[PDB]
Amino acid sequence: SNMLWALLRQYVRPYRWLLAVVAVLQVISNMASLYLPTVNAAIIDDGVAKGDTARIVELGAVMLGVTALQVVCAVGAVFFGARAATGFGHDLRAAVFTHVTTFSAEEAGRFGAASLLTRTTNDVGHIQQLVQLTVTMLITAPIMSIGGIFMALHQDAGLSWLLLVSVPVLGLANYWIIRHLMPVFTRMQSLIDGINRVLRDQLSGIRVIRAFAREPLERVRFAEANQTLSDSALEAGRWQALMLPVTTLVINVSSVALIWFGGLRIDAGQMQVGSLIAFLAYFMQILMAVLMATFMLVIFPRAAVCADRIGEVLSTQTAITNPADPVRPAAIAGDIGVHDATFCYPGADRPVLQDVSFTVPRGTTTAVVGSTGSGKSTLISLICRLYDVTSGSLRIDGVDVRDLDIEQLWSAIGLVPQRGYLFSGTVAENLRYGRADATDDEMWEALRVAAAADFVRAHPQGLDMPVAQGGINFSGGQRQRLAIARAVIRRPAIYLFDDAFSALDVHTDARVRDALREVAADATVVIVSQRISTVIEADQVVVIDDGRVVGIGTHDTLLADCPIYAEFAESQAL
Amino acid sequence: RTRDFKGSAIRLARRLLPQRALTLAVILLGVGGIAIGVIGPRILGHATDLLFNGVIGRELPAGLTKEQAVEAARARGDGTFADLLSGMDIVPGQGVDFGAVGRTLALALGLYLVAALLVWVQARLLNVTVQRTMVALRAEVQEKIHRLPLSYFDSRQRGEVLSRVTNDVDNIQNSVSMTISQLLTSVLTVFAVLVMMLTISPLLTLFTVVTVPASLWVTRWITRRSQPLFVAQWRNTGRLAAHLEETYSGFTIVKTFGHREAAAGKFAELNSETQQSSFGAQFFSGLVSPATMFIGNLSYVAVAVVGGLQVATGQITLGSIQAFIQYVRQFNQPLTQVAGMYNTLQSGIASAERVFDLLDTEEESADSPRRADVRTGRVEFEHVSFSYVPGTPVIEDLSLVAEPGSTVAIVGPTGAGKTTLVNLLMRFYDVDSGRITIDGVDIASVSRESLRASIGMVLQDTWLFAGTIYDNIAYGRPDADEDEVIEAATAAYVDRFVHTLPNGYDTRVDDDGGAISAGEKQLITIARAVLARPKLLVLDEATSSVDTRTELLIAHAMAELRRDRTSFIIAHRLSTIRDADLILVMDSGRIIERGTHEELLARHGRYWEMTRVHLG
Numbered sequence A: 001s002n003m004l005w006a007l008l009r010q011y012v013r014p015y016r017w018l019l020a021v022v023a024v025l026q027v028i029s030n031m032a033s034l035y036l037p038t039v040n041a042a043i044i045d046d047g048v049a050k051g052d053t054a055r056i057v058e059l060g061a062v063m064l065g066v067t068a069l070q071v072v073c074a075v076g077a078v079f080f081g082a083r084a085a086t087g088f089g090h091d092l093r094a095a096v097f098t099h100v101t102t103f104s105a106e107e108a109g110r111f112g113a114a115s116l117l118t119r120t121t122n123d124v125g126h127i128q129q130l131v132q133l134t135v136t137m138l139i140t141a142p143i144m145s146i147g148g149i150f151m152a153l154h155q156d157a158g159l160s161w162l163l164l165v166s167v168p169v170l171g172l173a174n175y176w177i178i179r180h181l182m183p184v185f186t187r188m189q190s191l192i193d194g195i196n197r198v199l200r201d202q203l204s205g206i207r208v209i210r211a212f213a214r215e216p217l218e219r220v221r222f223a224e225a226n227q228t229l230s231d232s233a234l235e236a237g238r239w240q241a242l243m244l245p246v247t248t249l250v251i252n253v254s255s256v257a258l259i260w261f262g263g264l265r266i267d268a269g270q271m272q273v274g275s276l277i278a279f280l281a282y283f284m285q286i287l288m289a290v291l292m293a294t295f296m297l298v299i300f301p302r303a304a305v306c307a308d309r310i311g312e313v314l315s316t317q318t319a320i321t322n323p324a325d326p327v328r329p330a331a332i333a334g335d336i337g338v339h340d341a342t343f344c345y346p347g348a349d350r351p352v353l354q355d356v357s358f359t360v361p362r363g364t365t366t367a368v369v370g371s372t373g374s375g376k377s378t379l380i381s382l383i384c385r386l387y388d389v390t391s392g393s394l395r396i397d398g399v400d401v402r403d404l405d406i407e408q409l410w411s412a413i414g415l416v417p418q419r420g421y422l423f424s425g426t427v428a429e430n431l432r433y434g435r436a437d438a439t440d441d442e443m444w445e446a447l448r449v450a451a452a453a454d455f456v457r458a459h460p461q462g463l464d465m466p467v468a469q470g471g472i473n474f475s476g477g478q479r480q481r482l483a484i485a486r487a488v489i490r491r492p493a494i495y496l497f498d499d500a501f502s503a504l505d506v507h508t509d510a511r512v513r514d515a516l517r518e519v520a521a522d523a524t525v526v527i528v529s530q531r532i533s534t535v536i537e538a539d540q541v542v543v544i545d546d547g548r549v550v551g552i553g554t555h556d557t558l559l560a561d562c563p564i565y566a567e568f569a570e571s572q573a574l
Numbered sequence B: 001r002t003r004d005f006k007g008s009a010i011r012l013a014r015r016l017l018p019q020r021a022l023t024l025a026v027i028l029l030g031v032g033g034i035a036i037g038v039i040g041p042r043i044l045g046h047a048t049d050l051l052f053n054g055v056i057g058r059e060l061p062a063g064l065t066k067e068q069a070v071e072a073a074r075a076r077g078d079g080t081f082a083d084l085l086s087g088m089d090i091v092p093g094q095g096v097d098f099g100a101v102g103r104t105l106a107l108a109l110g111l112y113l114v115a116a117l118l119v120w121v122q123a124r125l126l127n128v129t130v131q132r133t134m135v136a137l138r139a140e141v142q143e144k145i146h147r148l149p150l151s152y153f154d155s156r157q158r159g160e161v162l163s164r165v166t167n168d169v170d171n172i173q174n175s176v177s178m179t180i181s182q183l184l185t186s187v188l189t190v191f192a193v194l195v196m197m198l199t200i201s202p203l204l205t206l207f208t209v210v211t212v213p214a215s216l217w218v219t220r221w222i223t224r225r226s227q228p229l230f231v232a233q234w235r236n237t238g239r240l241a242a243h244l245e246e247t248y249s250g251f252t253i254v255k256t257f258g259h260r261e262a263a264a265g266k267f268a269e270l271n272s273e274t275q276q277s278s279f280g281a282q283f284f285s286g287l288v289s290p291a292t293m294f295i296g297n298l299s300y301v302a303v304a305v306v307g308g309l310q311v312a313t314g315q316i317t318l319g320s321i322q323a324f325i326q327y328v329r330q331f332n333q334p335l336t337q338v339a340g341m342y343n344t345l346q347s348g349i350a351s352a353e354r355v356f357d358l359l360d361t362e363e364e365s366a367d368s369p370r371r372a373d374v375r376t377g378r379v380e381f382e383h384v385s386f387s388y389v390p391g392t393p394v395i396e397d398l399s400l401v402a403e404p405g406s407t408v409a410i411v412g413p414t415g416a417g418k419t420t421l422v423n424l425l426m427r428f429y430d431v432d433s434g435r436i437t438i439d440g441v442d443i444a445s446v447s448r449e450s451l452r453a454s455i456g457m458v459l460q461d462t463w464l465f466a467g468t469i470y471d472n473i474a475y476g477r478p479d480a481d482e483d484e485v486i487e488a489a490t491a492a493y494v495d496r497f498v499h500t501l502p503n504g505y506d507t508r509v510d511d512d513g514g515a516i517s518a519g520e521k522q523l524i525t526i527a528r529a530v531l532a533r534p535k536l537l538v539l540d541e542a543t544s545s546v547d548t549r550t551e552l553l554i555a556h557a558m559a560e561l562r563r564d565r566t567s568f569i570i571a572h573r574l575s576t577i578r579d580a581d582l583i584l585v586m587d588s589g590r591i592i593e594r595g596t597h598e599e600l601l602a603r604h605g606r607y608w609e610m611t612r613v614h615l616g
């Protein structure tokens, strides 16, 4: 389609000279297989037609030479084809990765992390496998045809018109079928993918499908997918049923017209009898090329849907960019100044945050508290420009956050998000990640601070106990204490905890926070939590509900002043 | 695997039994299309041999006979041309006789015009009979899934039953139309095209069938010498896809902390290390076609030379070597596909017995027509003693009572058997040695369709199918107007976060931008169960990923201010369970202690020391 071609002509552009070599070796390797029946015609005419027995062996020698040349440039063609087809695909997933890693949190979350993974490896692969196979196994159909025309023009240029009337009518009657087949075939593929979706959703929720007694509603929702799939797969196979019969009928009618219009010349003394043995093989090789080239065009529609995903990624332009002349203070020593900040996803009815306006001092700790989906994690991501404000301002020390180099900001902030992630390797590699040159008496110090030193010292390999890919070999309370620890080997100015203490009991939560505001007593801490016990000793607590700030104060002066806060602390029996 | 091959084969092959007319008219209609592509070159060689007879038979002196011409040729020192003339039905003086050429070519044309009709009609009748046994196979798998007990789905592996109804039914189709279409005809065009060229020359068909061994040996030498290249390219793309998976999943931790360059340079390594290892495996896997066509052209140089050395001696005719060359390209054409059209039939009949074992596994227990009636609703267990696997009790001598207008609240550790108790109330599993009565009638003598609909549950894990939020909520009661769906969407507090979505109530659950949280999928699931107006409502920790204050409002408005609804609330945060009349405290299968909040609190039991773990 439009995006499969604009992608294929951009990323296979540096290998034009590896393609001009495959396209000159396929020509030689096809003209050398169209030349074996010519030397066979020479055997039939200078050999058989004479006595001349030696002329058959001393001309089958010329034929072994040609059949060796035909293979020394058919592996040389796949050698360069498999190099161009991997350079394309190297350069394509390099581009997809380099573009994805410029996205923001919103733009990366819009695609996902798995739909964004199977869009750079096994989705670049379906176009890599298209280039490979269209340069080594599909250009032979248009090369065998044109080369057969030139061979039929070399030998007996008078009966060559049969191959100028049979190749057009074969690439036209086979273009008609494919032009009517491509739509009914690309609809069948979005309809196989739907019936499977139905089965996946029925097997995943076979328990709630029954809790509601929806097996009548189901299997009427599946009987429409099954029957529609069969209706689109049965008309896609009535066009695919004309492909072989029509092409073989064209070749066979051309073959039976060959002997008539060629015997009319052989009687007239203007054609040798061996020139039929040659033309028949020209036709029967053009046939074998066209058949196996049209029987593997099913990869163009499946790799033009694949190239739509890659183009959708590559056409996404980021919106959060490091400004032109960013302000660069001597040291970002946190003082957060949310002024009238709102945030609304494009098209929504209600903004996530609306008219939020508060301020956390240089060496204090604020705590924002609210319900689910009330805008707490959206505020953390606004403080450190993972998201970008729409109608307000985020300031740190007095300078707008949109007016700072986004990389110096992140270097001053220690972030612990809700969806935390530990990277595979070593626990001393997951916290050699906030500092990158930490010693061991710093790693153990901050593992003590995060109350994580026990389960990492109680291990043979020391602070080298291997972590799985997602940090899955730990419990929640260990996985989110390593995440707090690697934010403590940074010594930031601004700590941003986003539900960082939810899988910890009140005891270890209080331990971690005591050890935190004892070694980082001069840093600005912002705690996002639904639990009130981790908010009791905050210097100020703000409550947000439906986006708006309902109340600001401390645990005591807000337990009476804010109805939502009192109702919130009453649901926990304080 | 594939514990049998005979029974599964004879059972799959008679799945093509309902329409045996279409299956018999595809086989005999393909036999008549093979007996013509074999007799076509042989008729066409007769036409090309009528030409050669008249061309090198009109230069001879007119008036002589075939014997005298051969004698004269021998006499004037032509040992080979005289043999040519001898093994050739000629007559000295006559021309081509285009009457015979015209009749032969008219037969060949009218018989090539029929073979392309018997193949079109075959491919059309083969597509009707295949896309008709699949619509009937894939449609009794569907009716099987709704008959199996829940003990079949959660005792299997994760993707096991999924990729047995969706990938094994795609391999049965690609094996039901591969072996009546591509390997029933490519065995006839190997037996017939071979018996036809044992009649032309048994010496030349020996130079052709000795490229089955040579072309099956080298397509087995290359694919075991490029085996250490598929295991340096599957584990070298599996490291790239593992780096990408963690640099995309921890993207706000790669982004923050500055490690964009350290993660982009590791990608530059893993990417120019899967290029080198994929080229090496895609070259050697690709030089198997240039190698099966070199051996195929060496058996063409051999035929063209020897059989052309054999026409010049008069042993065979020029028209029978043209036919034979047609057969050389028609014989070893279905010999560069035998690997595929046999491994597909192997793993198309292996994954055709999985499905048949799925279609033969025992169904559930043939329910009753009683149609449970619940007007008040008084649940009561009586010495329930369920166990999943024998010898390991999961519930032991349990007995509770509901009081129609109440809300009993089940708390306890993880593994106490709280969810299992809901699988017993919903009759997902059958109780062992004990009664379970809703409103008086044993639920074991009740149509499950009417029991499950007079109840309603929300489990801790949520199911949402591929659609909008509106559809996923209206799934609880489809015959409900837009207002009654938004009314249940408001009591479950999903109307709160749905106006902050770009297109609320139309935002697809399978195609959002991470817009729907994990606790918000639990709210959409609570709205789905309150839309059906259940009389018995069970909330099995379906409010565990949300605020503990949205939880106290949901299980206030839906459970405690509904005087006309009995409701179980299985909760982990037991601070929303207080002031909820009759807390039941379970442990290791049985109810240790019970009562209201104050009774159970001022008796110093397990509940007393559980209400004091979140408060020191």
Ligand SMILES: Nc1ncnc2c1ncn2[C@@H]1O[C@H](COP(=O)(O)OP(=O)(O)OP(=O)(O)O)[C@@H](O)[C@H]1O
Binding pocket: A106, A109, A110, A345, A352, A370, A371, A372, A373, A374, A375, A376, A377, A378, A379, A418, A499, A530, B497, B498, B500, B501, B502, B513, B514, B515, B516, B517, B519, B546
């Ligand atoms: N990628 C997205 N696209 C569109 N809408 C989104 C996206 N992510 C979140 N939202 C919506 O915006 C709101 C943001 O809520 P947010 O995640 O800040 O709440 P929260 O306080 O983090 O909730 P919790 O306490 O459960 O963590 C949510 O209600 C959600 O529905």
Ligand SMILES: Nc1ncnc2c1ncn2[C@@H]1O[C@H](COP(=O)(O)OP(=O)(O)O)[C@@H](O)[C@H]1O
Binding pocket: B154, B155, B388, B389, B394, B413, B414, B415, B416, B417, B418, B419, B420, B421
């Ligand atoms: N489908 C099952 N098959 C076998 N054992 C199970 C199954 N479901 C649960 N169990 C086991 O039986 C016990 C039942 O507890 P469960 O119903 O999960 O209560 P809870 O939800 O409170 O953990 C658990 O300890 C679990 O290990």
Ligand SMILES: [Mg+2]
Binding pocket: A376, A377, A378, A418
């Ligand atoms: Mg959040």
Ligand SMILES: [Mg+2]
Binding pocket: B418, B419, B460, B541
């Ligand atoms: Mg449970």
